[PDB]
């Protein structure tokens, strides 16, 4: 799977995109963290399906797949949200039936809303494309946990870096395909990758909130993630 | 005007701007135990030199003093950390906080382990000094740029300048790799590998800031006014 062309990498990633879920609230009746949590919990299931279709990810051990998802899942929900929200200045499209502005985020929620809104606006300014977005989301999946991991290990990390390298090649191909000069290409690569630092930052701040709730299962456990990932072949 | 430096001149400027390597102040003839005290004293002295360094990052002092403070308030711990990871590079398994304070993980350990992993990543990539100073400057310019939370005309001008300087550092990084003979493909791949490590350095800073805030001591986190005073 390290033998896909750049164009096939793109097709594969676009094909793998999760569905856009709806919030579950009675639209005929007049809670917020409740809605957001229910949404995130349903997305996680589809996120696992998506991860398994990221070329190269299922070549890893089960344990390493879990570790990467444990590190990246909130960043992945967040970049998804920021992407969806790109065409709604000043609002966050949590779901097509749950479009919130910052005053609807108002304890310690408006702080993270604002960061998400800033990132969406940055995406809008850069005119981020769908093909670029799916590359970036895959990069988060592969990179966020890689510094936190034996001979098999070295083989695992080497493979992860090879896949990351091929996504870089793909991003560059997309930019060359759109007519950017070599200078513009490396400049845009750099701009896009630096935004991943801010997405990390946001995830840390959000994780900080979810832990402060002290509810038994508000961070996906290793064993929960393993259960979702450790699929069987009887379907 | 420093948007008109050559890449070589950018590198020369950054290398010359490098802060000194400070020493820990413990009495070496006395015994050992303390640790957070030593680490804090070191960081507090480094911060002053950090401000001097920042003012020499081409393009930084063209910003308003308010924006200079905002960038440094965002980035200061990331900058201390990338500095640490860099001078620790040739000490596998240890962190060279200062030449007289080289610590292993047994001597927080959550944070030590992340820093040690980054040092090893730098070692694995054979990070060069010229690359290091570009990355450190990128942290300074990038870390706070999405939290300005103001869109006055001046702020728009500020963000544009920050991104033009960041673009120039990118050009400089690519120029360094071209000069070492890397192919175009290798150049782009290495640029990406280096920038993705910045995400981990952000992560570490957040984990570290969580620690310093949990201490509940009056000024462990540098206040806006303190940075303002140092940058005046
Ligand atoms: C992995 C699941 C198992 C237990 N679940 C706990 C609920 O965690 C979350 C995660 C994200 C969110 C909010 C959200 C919901 C859907 C989405 O597509 C993106 C986001 C972005 C973050 C957002 C949030 C996170 C933390 C505090 C406030 C808001 C809220 C609660 C997470
Ligand atoms: C801005 C200064 C004013 C008040 N100071 C509070 C002390 O903050 C720190 C910052 C970093 C450190 C440790 C350190 C010291 C020197 C250095 O060159 C790099 C580092 C990397 C982080 C390290 C640390 C940070 C947080 C918890 C444990 C260890 C310890 C205390 C910070």
Numbering used by the authors:
A (entry chain B): 307 to 336, 341 to 416, 419 to 461, 465 to 550
B (entry chain A): 306 to 338, 341 to 414, 421 to 545
Sentences copied from the publication:
We also solved structures with the WT LBD for those molecules with no existing structures (LA-Deg, LA-Stab, RU39411) or were able to solve to improved resolution (RAL). LA-3 possesses a 3 R methylpyrrolidine (similar to OP1074) and showed a SERD-like profile with an IC50 of 26.94 ± 0.4 nM and maximum normalized fluorescence of 0.48 ± 0.07 at 5 μM. LA3-2 and LA5-2 are subsequently referred to as LA-Deg and LA-Stab for Laso degrader and stabilizer respectively. We discovered that addition of a 3R-methyl group on Laso’s pyrrolidine induced both ERα SUMOylation and degrading activities, while addition of a 2S-methyl on the pyrrolidine leads to an accumulation of ERα in the breast cancer cells. LA-Deg induces SUMOylation but to a lesser maximum than fulvestrant and GDC0927 in WT and is further reduced in Y537S, while LA-Stab did not induce SUMOylation with either receptor. LA-Deg showed a slightly increase induction compared to ICI and Veh, but it was significantly lower than Laso. Despite their unique influences on WT ERα cellular stability, the methylated Laso derivatives showed identical transcriptional antagonistic efficacies in the WT and mutant cell lines compared to unmodified Laso in our assay. Overall, these structures present canonical ERα LBD homodimers with 2–4 monomers in the asymmetric unit.
The pro-oncogenic cellular activities of estrogen receptor alpha (ERα) drive breast cancer pathogenesis. Ligand-dependent transcriptional activities depend on the association of coactivator proteins with ERα to form functional complexes. SERMs and SERDs elicit a structural rearrangement of the ERα LBD to sterically preclude binding of coactivators in the activating function-2 cleft. Activating somatic mutations near ERα helix 12, Y537S and D538G, enable hormone therapy resistance in metastatic ER +breast cancers.
